[PDB]
Structures are given as C-alpha cells and as structure tokens.
Amino acid sequence: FLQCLSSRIPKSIIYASNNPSYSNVLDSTTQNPRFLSSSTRNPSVIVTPFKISHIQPTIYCSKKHGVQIRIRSGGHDYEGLSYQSSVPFFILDLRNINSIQVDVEKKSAWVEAGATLGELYYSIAKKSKTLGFPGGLCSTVGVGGQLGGGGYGYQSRTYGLASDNIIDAQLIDARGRILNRKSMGEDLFWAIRGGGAGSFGIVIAWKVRLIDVPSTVTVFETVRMWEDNVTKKFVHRYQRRASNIDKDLTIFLGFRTTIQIITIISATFHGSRDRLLPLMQEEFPELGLGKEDFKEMSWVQSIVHYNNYKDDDPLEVLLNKTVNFEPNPFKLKSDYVKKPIPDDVLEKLLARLYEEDIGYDFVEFFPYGGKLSEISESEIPFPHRAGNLYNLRYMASWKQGENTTRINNHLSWVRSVYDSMTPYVSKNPRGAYLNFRDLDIGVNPNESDTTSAYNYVKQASVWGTKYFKNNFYKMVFIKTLVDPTNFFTYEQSIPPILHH
Ligand SMILES: *Cc1cc2c(nc3c(=O)[nH]c(=O)nc-3n2C[C@H](O)[C@H](O)[C@H](O)COP(=O)(O)OP(=O)(O)OC[C@H]2O[C@@H](n3cnc4c(N)ncnc43)[C@H](O)[C@@H]2O)c(*)c1C
Ligand SMILES: *[C@@H]1O[C@H](CO)[C@@H](O)[C@H](O)[C@H]1NC(C)=O
C-alpha cells in the first residue's frame, strides 16, 4: 500500500507509523478522548492532500491493496469512525483542503471539506454582519462531516439544518471521478445532504445558501435547582411549548448533578431583547427573567459565546482547531420524543444521574418544530421532522485513565438509561440522529457473512431506518449505482444491492 502511494503522491503528504509526526497528526483530530487508547485507532498511513489531484491515486492504491479508506475532515464523529477500523485501513485527512469563497451579493459560499464551522462563520462575519449559515454549534467541527449528516444548532428551528441549506457540491466517487451537482445527478446530490456522504464518495466542497440574520440576536442562560416546583413546572411546560413557540426562539435544556440536580436553560432568540421580553413573560412567566437577564449581541458573537469564549473575544477564537476546554471521554445516545414524558417518569429518569459521580452524566433536550416541522420526511435523507418535540440526548463521561471495569460501568449506565426510556420515545423505527452517531443501534455484517443481497440490506436497515426512515431504501439503490463494488465501507455504510 505504502509503496503504491509513494510512487504516485508527494512524500510530504504521507504519514506512516514510522514518521515522527504521525502521532501528532493522528491525535490532533481524535476529538472524542475515549478513543485515545483504542486498539483500532491504528491507521497504517495518514494522507493529508493539499490539492485535489492527490486524492485519485489514494483511491487506486486503496482498492488494489485492500486497505480500507476512512475519511476525516474535522474528526468529530462521536464514535470516531473517521480514524478507527477493525480491518487494515488508512485515513484520508482533508484538513488542508480548506478554502472558503464567500459571495455576499449572491448570498452563497463554497466551503471545502477541511474547513471548520468556525472558519466558515469567521469568513462570513468578516464580510457581513447580517449574513449567517445554520451550520451547528461547535466551532471546531468539520463541514466535510457535518453537512453530510444534518447539522443541528440554535438556528435550526429558524432556518433548517445545515443540510437543508446546500445548493451544490463537488464529490469524488469510487471511480475517481470529480462530480458536481449536475454530473452527479439529483439522486446522489440528495443522498449526500444528510445521508452520511462517506457512504457514497469524498465530498471536496459544499456550496451553501447563506441566511439573513438580524443584526441583533439575544441570548440568555440560567441555572435552577431541579428540586424546585417552579423549575418542575417550567420543564413541564417546556416539553409542550419548546417545539411550538415562535420559531425565532430556541431553548436548550440540560441536567447534571452538582448533592442535587441542577437545570441549565440556555437560549438564542433571533431578535432584540425588547421583542423577547413579552414572549418570555407570556410563555414562561414562572422563570421571572428580567430585562437584564437577556444579553444582546451579533449573530457571530452569539456563536463565540456558546463556544465557551468571552463575549467580547476577538473573532479569531473561531479559528482555533481544538475545543476551549479539556475534554473528558464520553459515550452518548439519543432518542426522539413525540409525546411529553410523564412527570413521574421524568423524575425517575433524572434520578439516575445520582448513580454515577457528580457532574459526569447528562440529560439534554434539543427542541424540534419550527422550520423542522415544515420540511417533509424525504426532502433530504434526514427524516426527523414534524411530530417530534425534541431530541433527547443521554451522556456519560469519565476521566482519561479509568480502568476497564469502570468504563464498562459508565457504558452500561447510559445504555440502561436508554433501555429504560423505550416505552416513552419513538418506535418502529426508534429514531436516532446520524450526527449523534451510535453504533449500539446496529452495525453492518461483514458483507461476506451474509446469505443474500436482501439479507445484507435487511440487517443494515436495523440502523438504517432509525437514522433515515425509508429514505434508507432509496439510498440503497443510489449506493448500488454509484459504488457497486462497495469501496466506501464501514460499520454503518449504506450497503449496495450485491450482484452475487
Ligand atoms: C466534537 C463535537 C461534535 C459535535 C458538536 N456539536 C454538534 C452540534 O451542535 N450538532 C450536531 O449535529 N453535531 C455536533 N457534533 C457532531 C459533529 O458535528 C458530527 O458528528 C459530524 O459528523 C462531524 O463532522 P466532522 O467534523 O467532519 O468529523 P468527521 O469525523 O471528519 O466526519 C464525521 C463523519 O463524516 C465522514 N466524512 C467527513 N468528511 C467527509 C468527506 N469530505 N466526505 C465524505 N465523508 C466525510 C467521516 O468519515 C465520518 O463518518 C460539538 C463538538 C465539540
Ligand atoms: C483562540 O484564538 C485566540 C486569538 O489568538 C486566542 O487568544 C485563544 O487562546 C485561542 N483559543 C485556544 C488556543 O484554545
């Protein structure tokens, strides 16, 4: 494999195990610290192209020598699939493929896969205070992965997901052909906008629609005690109102221990605080929030704020490539909720936070509705639309270095929490969020360990219909057309219809 690469691409973009910088390049975007001790995080080579023509030979060498491709842009995949495999593999790391072209007059931008959300937001904000992009929250996330999987954040109720706002793309397929929207066709251009683009090809660049944002947005955040009847009433009404209120207001909810359970309420309102005050006093008067609890800022300042930087920090903090906190290993799972959880079941859920160490486990609510209930189930592969109140996320975290038995304890905790919620969350299929990737919901069999093509597809649909509902089956046909030999494979790759 390595011989084939070195006779075809410059040595300067090739990092093998023997290279002293291999470990830095590997670790630099291993973004879930849980996998820093994974035995499957051992690519034989990391390739870091700096121009497009570097990529086609890596496809050729990968096919000819049986070395599986793992595509990494931001490396934020929550299961670390961009840098692990149980078969011999290499990482095509697109960090240097990162140019951004912003057209303020046409309200559009071309963004290469290795650019981060922070770099995109930075480039927009340097040119206009009133344009934005609803890309998601984390400034270090790569657009290469994010825009292929949905991409949710404080703007999604107002403007849609990141994948709801894509108008062209450049993609390299398994034959090494570099295609745009016109030459890839509408089916494949549909599939990559939220279907997990790495099942179909290597996205080189996305063309996005820029959104009009108000020159003033308003944020607020407060921490309350859960053992407080006003907090409980607010949360009771939150379940019923968060997805139905004014689409300009998005409110997140989080719970952790600190010994009591605290409730974190955080929000962004796409408007001034004079507009926000009557809305909050009509929807949640029990919060008692005054004029001075709302802080006005620009759209990009609100992104800086919610990435744990100072409100008045220079925009350059958006260009940093690692999070502004030291991260703990973690395992998250998520569910979709269509009916309010009963009061006493919510109490039983939150009490499970007492079972592990203080402040290390979390339950979080991300509301749907708004624009997300206006878009059909099949507009793009992302299917989680009207009828969903919120996505409910469960997470356990621990410190780097805990022994195996304690990690298993943490994994078992969050899995049992998930199992306990089966009666109260979506079913048939039990929905799951691709960008909250969870291997526990099902993985592919080894294609050689199936008994038929139908068998391969049906097994894969276990996880497939959870992420995509029946968009999964349209994606199976598209996969069959554009990658019939299954060059792009991994634990949750869309399967082709195998010929024999
Ligand atoms: C670490 C982190 C992740 C976050 C954060 N906040 C999020 C939020 O507010 N909303 C979300 O919806 N997701 C959030 N995430 C998760 C990540 O945004 C998603 O998990 C993305 O999928 C990660 O994208 P990226 O940064 O590129 O990480 P990768 O591992 O490189 O990509 C994930 C996935 O996509 C494939 N892939 C990447 N690049 C390509 C290209 N060019 N072509 C095809 N396929 C590609 C990878 O193989 C992998 O499977 C907040 C934080 C702190
Ligand atoms: C982010 O960029 C700013 C500007 O240089 C810098 O002050 C800050 O330390 C950076 N954040 C990091 C290194 O996490």
Author numbering: 30 to 287, 298 to 539
What does the paper say about this structure?
Diels-Alderases (DAs), functionally unique enzymes catalysing [4 + 2] cycloaddition reactions, have received considerable research interest. Unlike most BBE-like enzymes, which typically catalyze various oxidation reactions using FAD as a cofacor, such as oxidative cyclization by EcBBE20, tetrahydrocannabinolic acid synthase (THCAS), and cannabidiol acid synthase (CBDAS), and oxidative dehydrogenation by MaMO and AtBBE-like 1323, MaDA stands out because it catalyzes a non-redox intermolecular Diels–Alder reaction.
To gain insight into the structure-function relationships between OCs and DAs, we determined the crystal structure of a multifunctional Diels-Alderase MaDA1. Comparative analysis of the protein structures of MaDA1, ancDA, and ancDADS revealed a similar overall fold to BBE-like enzymes, as previously reported. Specifically, they possess six β-sheets (β12-14 and β16-18), one α-helix (α11), one loop (loop in MaDA1), and a cofactor FAD, and share a similar substrate-binding pocket among these enzymes. Notably, the structural analysis also suggested the volumes of the substrate-binding pockets in ancDADS, ancDA, MaDA, and MaDA1 are similar, indicating that no significant substrate-binding pocket expansion occurred during the evolution of the standalone DAs. Enzymatic assays showed that ancDA is functionally similar to MaDA1 and MaDA4. In contrast, the transition state maintains an interaction with the active site of ancDADS-mut4 as well as ancDA and MaDA1 over the course of our simulation.
